[PDB]
Amino acid sequence: GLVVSFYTPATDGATFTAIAQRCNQQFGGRFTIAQVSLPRSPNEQRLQLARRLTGNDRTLDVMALDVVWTAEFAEAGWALPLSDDPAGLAENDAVADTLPGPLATAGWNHKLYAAPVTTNTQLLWYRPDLVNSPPTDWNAMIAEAARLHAAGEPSWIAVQANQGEGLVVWFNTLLVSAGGSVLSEDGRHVTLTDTPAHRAATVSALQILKSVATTPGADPSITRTEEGSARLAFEQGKAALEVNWPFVFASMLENAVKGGVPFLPLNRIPQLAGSINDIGTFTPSDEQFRIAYDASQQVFGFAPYPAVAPGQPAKVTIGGLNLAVAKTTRHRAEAFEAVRCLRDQHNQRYVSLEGGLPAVRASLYSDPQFQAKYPMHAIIRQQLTDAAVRPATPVYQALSIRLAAVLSPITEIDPESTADELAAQAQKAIDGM
Ligand SMILES: NNNC[C@H]1O[C@H](O[C@H]2O[C@H](CNNN)[C@@H](O)[C@H](O)[C@H]2O)[C@H](O)[C@@H](O)[C@@H]1O
């Protein structure tokens, strides 16, 4: 029958292809979901979609939107409100058994414009064979990287953050963790420097970025404008401390079994041979998972994101993907039906355990069979409960570009003057409304 296109980031395309294929057996030939890949960066994902939306591409049906695009797409009329479902089922489906942090990212002006499908929060990843105890705060992280550098041990702090959205994410986490915020609640004022408490938070966050950037043994790619991978730096043994999204867990086991992780040679364990399936994905039996996970715990551990203020947890910026129906669709009913299928319980288990993307369904975090294959479940749920959020604003794209340009390169941050430049550049973004 008809085709419901489903646009997703390319790096998630294989996972969402598998989910769509399952969702295609259950429609009785009524319609087919066809996954289509978007570029790698949040900005380029947005740009492709926005061009199809303003060009009235009537073949565009469902979109997996980064959480930061809700306000823009809702205000533009690009994402239909869930109340536009002709079946009247989308709003109830979106909220049922769904964690509240993800749902907050899918709303605008008191209505839902998307149904959460994946969430995200960054954890600390470390080498327990080199790091006795995982650092609990950023001053401790810096001390540990220095101690490692002294011992001729891998010394990079691998943070997912070059010159783009990931750097804004890192700054946002530090800033909110310190009690600050980029914008006011309504999104209409810049709050980086408008009170002494807010200025103090901004300066504290910038001090951490500068200190990490200039720790002995720091990654030489900080000043270069290339796009390194924190994930691969850690897997290659160049960092013993990494802060990153939880997909690094599935990557570590899979790549170790393929022989790509020097300090974790799971490829030499006979019981794991053939645990990579015919399309390249680690697909262990329960016993194979136990063997791989137990081996990995010697060289790979996880911990909460480091705090800014010692003694209480960080407030960690939330990420993820929300499913929206484009205003271009010719088939609203089928597009909202597809959204409900893509986020059902079975596909939520798959997106986390095979795809590495945290599920949004609250039940899974209380399910012992999920918890046994997703060992970071409790820290993830904790960090999703008191999450930092990036500012929700229709001019987010312009705001993020302006902030990233001030922050990068982080070796050049001067906390007091950089705080004023950040506030001035944020104001310019807000003024374009
Ligand atoms: N395949 N696992 N990768 C996870 C996820 O990472 C990105 O999204 C996350 O980071 C974004 C910032 N850019 N990071 N360099 C952030 O905006 C987003 O909210 C996070 O979910 C990828 O964009 C995404 O495709 C990946 O799924």
- d(C-alpha 334, C-alpha 321), whole Å: 20
31 appears as a binding residue in the annotation: no
Which residue's CA is the nearest one to ligand 1's atom 13?
Answer: 166
Separation of CA 142 and ligand 1 centre (Å): 25
How many Cβ atoms from other residues are within 10 Å of residue 219's Cβ? 20
Q: Are 304 and 123 in contact (CB under 8 A)?
A: yes
172 marked as binding residue: no
Ligand 1 centre and the CA of 197: distance in Å? 31
CB 400 within 8 A of CB 78: no
160 lines ligand 1 (CB under 6 A): yes
Distance 44 CA to ligand 1 centre (A): 12
Domains and CATH numbers, the chain: 2-120+319-385 (3.40.190.10), 123-303 (3.40.190.10)
- HEC sequence for the chain: CEEEEEEEEHHHHHHHHHHHHHHHHCCCCCEEEEEEEECCCHHHHHHHHHHHHHCCCCCCCEEEEEHHHHHHHHHCCCECCHHHCCCCCHHHHHHCCECHHHHHHCEECCEECCEEEEEECCEEEECCCCCCCCCCEHHHHHHHHHHHHHCCCCCEEEECCCCCHHHHHHHHHHHHHCCCCCECCCCCCECCCCCHHHHHHHHHHHHHHHHHHCCCCCCHHHCCCCCCCHHHHHHCCCEEEEEECCHHHHHHHHHHHHCCCCCCCHHHCHHHCCCECCCCCECCCHHHHHHHHHHHCCCCEEECCCECCCCCCCCCECEEEEEEEECCCCCHHHHHHHHHHHCCHHHHHHHHHCCCCCECEHHHHCCHHHHHHCCCHHHHHHHHHCCECCCCCCCHHHHHHHHHHHHCCHHHCCHHHHHHHHHHHHHHHHHCC
Q: Pick from 65, 169, 399, 407 the residue to mutate for probing ligand 1's pocket: most ligand atoms within 8 Å of its CB.
A: 169
The residue whose CA is least distant from atom 6 of ligand 1 is 245
